[PDB]
Amino acid sequence: MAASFLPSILVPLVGLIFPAFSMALFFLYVQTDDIA
């Protein structure tokens, strides 16, 4: 393992996985009927 691999590892995680999960979480939070 080397740090030079990190972009091709991390960029898909930051630009695809993270926005998708963040958007799904925000959608679920805004659709929740009782938050508190």
Partner 1 sequence: ANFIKPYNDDPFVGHLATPITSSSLTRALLKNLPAYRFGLTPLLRGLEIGLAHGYFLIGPFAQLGPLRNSDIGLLAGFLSTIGLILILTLGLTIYGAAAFGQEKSNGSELQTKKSWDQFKGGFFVGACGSAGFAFICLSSIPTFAL
Q: Name which of 10 and 24 has its Cβ closer to partner 1.
A: 24
- Residues ≥6 apart with Cβ < 8 Å to 29: 35
User: Binders of ligand CLA among 5-24, rule CB under 6 A?
Assistant: 6-7, 10-11, 14
**Using CB distances below 5 to 8 A depending on partner kind, what does residue 19 bind out of partner 1, ligand CLA, none?**
none
Number of H helices, E strands in the chain: 2, 0
The distance of closest approach from Cβ of residue 34 to ligand CLA in the complex, given in angstroms and rounded to an integer, is: 28
> Where do contacts with partner 1 occur on this chain (CB under 8 A)?
20, 24, 27-28, 31, 33
DSSP classification of residue 33: S
Residue 26 in 3-state DSSP?
Answer: helix
